[PDB]
Design an enzyme around this catalytic site. Structure first.
Site, PDB file in Angstrom:
ATOM      1  N   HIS A  54       0.793  -1.223   0.000  1.00 38.29           N
ATOM      2  CA  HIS A  54       0.000   0.000   0.000  1.00 38.29           C
ATOM      3  C   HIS A  54       0.828   1.276   0.000  1.00 38.29           C
ATOM      4  O   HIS A  54       0.267   2.367   0.158  1.00 38.29           O
ATOM      5  CB  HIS A  54      -0.950   0.021   1.194  1.00 38.29           C
ATOM      6  CG  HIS A  54      -1.742  -1.234   1.346  1.00 38.29           C
ATOM      7  ND1 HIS A  54      -1.381  -2.229   2.224  1.00 38.29           N
ATOM      8  CD2 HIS A  54      -2.865  -1.666   0.728  1.00 38.29           C
ATOM      9  CE1 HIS A  54      -2.257  -3.214   2.154  1.00 38.29           C
ATOM     10  NE2 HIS A  54      -3.164  -2.901   1.247  1.00 38.29           N
TER      11      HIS A  54
ATOM     12  N   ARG B 196      -5.533  16.860   2.422  1.00 40.29           N
ATOM     13  CA  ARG B 196      -5.119  17.626   3.589  1.00 40.29           C
ATOM     14  C   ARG B 196      -3.671  17.343   3.959  1.00 40.29           C
ATOM     15  O   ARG B 196      -2.951  18.249   4.393  1.00 40.29           O
ATOM     16  CB  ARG B 196      -6.071  17.332   4.740  1.00 40.29           C
ATOM     17  CG  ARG B 196      -5.659  17.906   6.067  1.00 40.29           C
ATOM     18  CD  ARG B 196      -5.680  19.373   6.096  1.00 40.29           C
ATOM     19  NE  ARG B 196      -6.974  19.915   5.704  1.00 40.29           N
ATOM     20  CZ  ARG B 196      -7.174  21.202   5.471  1.00 40.29           C
ATOM     21  NH1 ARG B 196      -6.227  22.084   5.704  1.00 40.29           N
ATOM     22  NH2 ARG B 196      -8.349  21.611   5.001  1.00 40.29           N
TER      23      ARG B 196
ATOM     24  N   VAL C 221      -4.133  13.814  13.253  1.00 39.57           N
ATOM     25  CA  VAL C 221      -4.615  15.189  13.230  1.00 39.57           C
ATOM     26  C   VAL C 221      -5.903  15.177  12.427  1.00 39.57           C
ATOM     27  O   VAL C 221      -5.907  14.810  11.250  1.00 39.57           O
ATOM     28  CB  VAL C 221      -3.574  16.158  12.656  1.00 39.57           C
ATOM     29  CG1 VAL C 221      -2.355  16.193  13.574  1.00 39.57           C
ATOM     30  CG2 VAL C 221      -3.118  15.818  11.252  1.00 39.57           C
ATOM     31  N   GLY C 222      -7.007  15.487  13.070  1.00 38.27           N
ATOM     32  CA  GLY C 222      -8.268  15.236  12.415  1.00 38.27           C
ATOM     33  C   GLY C 222      -9.348  16.233  12.749  1.00 38.27           C
ATOM     34  O   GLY C 222      -9.116  17.240  13.423  1.00 38.27           O
TER      35      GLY C 222
ATOM     36  N   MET D 276     -13.486   8.334  13.776  1.00 35.87           N
ATOM     37  CA  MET D 276     -13.550   6.989  13.233  1.00 35.87           C
ATOM     38  C   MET D 276     -12.251   6.203  13.257  1.00 35.87           C
ATOM     39  O   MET D 276     -12.270   5.050  12.809  1.00 35.87           O
ATOM     40  CB  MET D 276     -14.102   6.990  11.792  1.00 35.87           C
ATOM     41  CG  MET D 276     -15.495   7.554  11.684  1.00 35.87           C
ATOM     42  SD  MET D 276     -16.159   7.460  10.001  1.00 35.87           S
ATOM     43  CE  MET D 276     -16.195   5.741   9.732  1.00 35.87           C
TER      44      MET D 276
ATOM     45  N   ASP E 105     -18.539  19.784  13.876  1.00 41.72           N
ATOM     46  CA  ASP E 105     -19.984  19.661  13.907  1.00 41.72           C
ATOM     47  C   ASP E 105     -20.421  19.308  15.317  1.00 41.72           C
ATOM     48  O   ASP E 105     -19.779  18.490  15.994  1.00 41.72           O
ATOM     49  CB  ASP E 105     -20.464  18.548  12.958  1.00 41.72           C
ATOM     50  CG  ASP E 105     -20.216  18.864  11.488  1.00 41.72           C
ATOM     51  OD1 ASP E 105     -21.068  19.539  10.873  1.00 41.72           O
ATOM     52  OD2 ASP E 105     -19.175  18.447  10.937  1.00 41.72           O
TER      53      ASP E 105
END
Lengths: 240, 240, 240, 240, 240, 240
Positions: free
Chosen positions: E9, E29, E93-94, E185, E209
């Site tokens: 991968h 990103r 980092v999200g 997630m 959100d």
């Protein structure tokens, strides 16, 4: 000619079962019990070949009916008996295997509670451990009847499996470690149904096979074991 | 007079089953199938009243036998058929309920896979999700046979429950949400056993009852549905 | 001054426990039992304040010790008693709540088996349902002792929870539906340990609180209930 | 310059997807499919690099889009396609490993149902076993298309794992015992979503690696396998 | 032209990743981070569009790479980074949602541990509860960096779900009751992999959100939040 | 003479606990802590021998109380402290075992999160994985206090088991593989209760035993370890 069906699985009319019922897996064995031990007997169910009979034992009303193999099968028949037929006490009369080194082929086992690999009891108690537990008066009646008949018994836990043809490594060792005395397929489904209806159940079995040694009762030995177990069960019904 | 037993549950001699077997829950229905559709027929099992027969359909060897109610029961009979009797293909022929608003009483349902509340398949696959899946050639033979006979069918998922007398809130809504077409008690136990033996299985059922509306087929409607389903199954065996 | 420790949790020397032991959650209650009912009594454990005593009841060796709250706590103490101290019989003597509408505050409950929300029994039996089951001779000794003392009893299932402060919706309704008579926190951990060691266990409890009505025994009522229960247990030990 | 987003993960406008969509894990493979097999093609999604395209195959509307790796990823994309974009049929086109001794590297596998170690399907069906099952018309279209193209196929079960880098002892042996033909990571998440929306799904994969022997297709062999599989899938779309 | 692949991968050569890596779900990103904050930067992975880059931040080696959506996806990439690429520290980092009434859109959340509905951690710890736990030095470096930058933060638990499109009743109420601050997630899959390799991981996210109120950051607000979070993460790497 | 009981398990009056509480399993150790480190001390609980005390450490209010052995026991005491007694911060101060090859007997372990084999946290989060996670300010106060005292520490995950006497094959290997530093029985029950009440918790333990090598601290070594750990905890309370 169509007959009205009180349940989808039983041709008996409401009231056609006694309040006390013996049940065994094999319907042909139910017929043998009726023919050899009941008086005033009549066949009350024929559906699916699952023969059931009502008569008397020593004058007291008693029925006997097959339940088929496995928890789902006995659950159908027992739910209907307690709910529609208003039965009060069911004693399962069966055969079993054993792994316990101190339990021998031909022994009579009186079941106090039964473990299982089925999910049906978790579903009844929010996913938790719900012990399938025999009624104490039923257990005691079986124990006392065997004592009066001078027939030795083993008293303790059964294990009711969904899989007759086990491939499960380590199962027999765990059953032996914790002194499960009887391996069979139905009792763990019966006891919680009795509980739901505020009714009573128990189980007595004879050891047909040693799962470890492969010792196995001959036909003649199975008849002798059956005669001992059934007499214990029948005498116990007089006290219930 | 004692007879040798090739399995604990079947009186048939090795070789007495054809490579293709139809199985239904009710042994009395197995006898009806044999009597009305098989030639060269002989009864090959009587144990526990679980009638089984071997003969031919349009010249091709075919057996039919009851399997009793529930996963544990069919598992015993099917394991023995694939292992001892060397059967290659089993088609379960049954009745079912439905919750799907687009499935109607009297419909014929061909099963591609079956869900379950049993633990038996988790036990086979390290606790994971093992889909009980029909063999594609069997499914296709059933679909094509119904097309040739001009009998409409529904094709899709079944759900095999251990509990006929459900008390489970939200189950019917989930089954409907995901378009389970048939509710019954056995197919999810059959398909993984076929897999174990490198063999084939499928299932076809007729809708006897709508679980939501309580619409229910009359005896005459059940006979018509049975005639349609059994002809589909029998014609499918010629291709398998 | 350091003393040799036969286990990490018990200061008793090997042999300092009788073969029969009563255990209760509160060590201060163990001391009350010893002081009021044992003769020849000596304190044999002080570790963690978990007071334990050995003496005689009507001349027969008997010990009494606290077990703390919850399955993990009783499991430590009981494992050590059966394994290191060679105890043969443990009777848990406790208090409980009830949800059953026919069980009342101050009632005496004799436990035949105990359900649980703990994972400890699944771990012992390959993830399956292992009923925590009292030994029949112990149950019967308790029942017979209460009969001889003319003290009414309820006999049936307990439920041993890990969570005293339940937030679980639907639990009480399910416990009542299936006629669980006693809600407590320990017995389901005790019975499988007895099984592992080929030993015996039982449990008797008095109802201190009705979980539904919030009826609750006063201090005086709790003393009367305790006196009844402990006399039953002590007399039962003479038969074990 | 900001663009309106019909979903959080897709830049396509409502209506920009055809009713039939092919999906593969690698977005760069989606572009290869579009560039080499679609006409009238336009790129309709760029978000997160998850390239998606809409055009025609032999005049019929068809889209192709990447789905990323794993059940959670395909679940996002497929939920959106069925719900917001009103897609009717999704065929996953992928690569897989195998453990089955009769399945070989370069083989084409058509999936009838997929097992999993994910919890996502238990969550949809009250904790029970929900088989992730392909739609029969989709399976049949794939089978028939391969037959018309004279390309051999294997038809049967896949297993969709959350863990590419397995450390799980006994898994491969169980997968082989029950004749799982394909090991991959996504199909078990797709099929239940199709069910929720009353829509259709299937999967076809080529074997890139033998998990037991470590045989592995070269780049040239992977191109040949891809060409066979994609032609089967594209021709199948004409029938769906 | 074929290139050697160190993993299935990732196109990077062994050694092409720094010992410290930032990872985000969206590969686009990752490119923005590299282009705006790294010097000496080169792209080191292109496979599956999962862009990854290696350069320096304030002279110290640092890489940044996308991880895709969901536990299975990040598990592939992180396993490879720790195992083949010998990475020592990964900071995710999200972005995230929140249900906590005291956490607001645009807040920066530093994750100490993450719950999940995935089965991947049970599989690592014999079916038990394995907390996905951030390394304390990483958490502390993030906290201290935000303090030095005068950027407020929330510190606490995340929840990593397999299902972006939740249908699960009662989940948000339970997450709020126990003060889970971030819903995302991936992090619960990362931390146990770091543990396996004796390495380090953490996570910092910005609230995009509010799951209850549906307040949602505009594009401009998301850029401001990103700038704050990424500066915190980059400064933290200087201490790790 | 009867006293009013604010909870069923604690004789303290509302307000008799400080907002910060140290808790250890052994009530006799709670008394040692009070006698040797608290001023203005008074005993506030005697129920079940579970000694608890309130006083000051360096002028700041501080309580110390035993919690007994196991998750169910600490859950009772901690629920009551946070709910009825309005406690804000609990630090568990304990002993532990280790399997980690880099953790040695006498080491001080500061716990960031704790795994478990209990079901109590699944029950709180819809059956999912809920990490029992220490509050970051508490962890940091412990780390910083040890640094100021020049006492080395290990920081990382604990594992809280219900079964002191483990028989579980493969557990120690998995705990070591994932670098669990401390094996004990309670912390995983404490942290979620703190969360429920919007309060804070942590844990610090000293290694008494190496589970692999059976190295074990002598009484003198346990006193030295205790002195180090308790000073760290007490100094940390000044910052909380």
């Amino acid at each position: 000619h169509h007959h009205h069906m009180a349940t989808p699985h039983n041709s008996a009319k409401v009231g056609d079962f006694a309040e006390t019922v013996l049940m065994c897996g094999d319907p042909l064995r139910a017929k043998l019990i009726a023919d050899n031990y009941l008086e005033n007997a009549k066949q009350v169910n024929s559906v699916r070949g699952m023969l059931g009979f009502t008569g008397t034992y020593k004058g007291k009303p008693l029925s006997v009916m097959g339940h088929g193999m496995g928890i789902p099968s006995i659950s159908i028949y027992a739910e209907e008996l307690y709910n529609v037929y208003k039965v009060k006490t069911i004693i399962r009369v069966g055969t079993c295997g054993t792994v316990d080194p101190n339990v021998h082929v031909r022994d009579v086992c009186i079941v106090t509670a039964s473990g299982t690999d089925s999910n049906v009891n978790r579903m009844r108690l929010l996913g938790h451990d719900f012990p399938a537990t025999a009624n104490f008066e039923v257990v005691s009646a079986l124990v006392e009847s065997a004592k009066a008949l001078n027939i030795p018994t083993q008293v303790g836990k059964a294990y009711s499996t969904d899989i007759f043809y086990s491939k499960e490594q380590g199962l027999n060792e765990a059953l032996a470690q914790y002194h499960f005395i009887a391996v069979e397929m139905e009792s763990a489904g019966l006891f919680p149904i009795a509980d739901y209806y505020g009714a009573r159940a128990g189980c007595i079995c004879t050891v047909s096979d040693h799962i470890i040694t492969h010792e196995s009762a001959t036909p003649e030995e199975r008849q002798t074991s059956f005669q001992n177990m059934i007499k214990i069960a029948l005498e116990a019904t007089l006290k219930l």
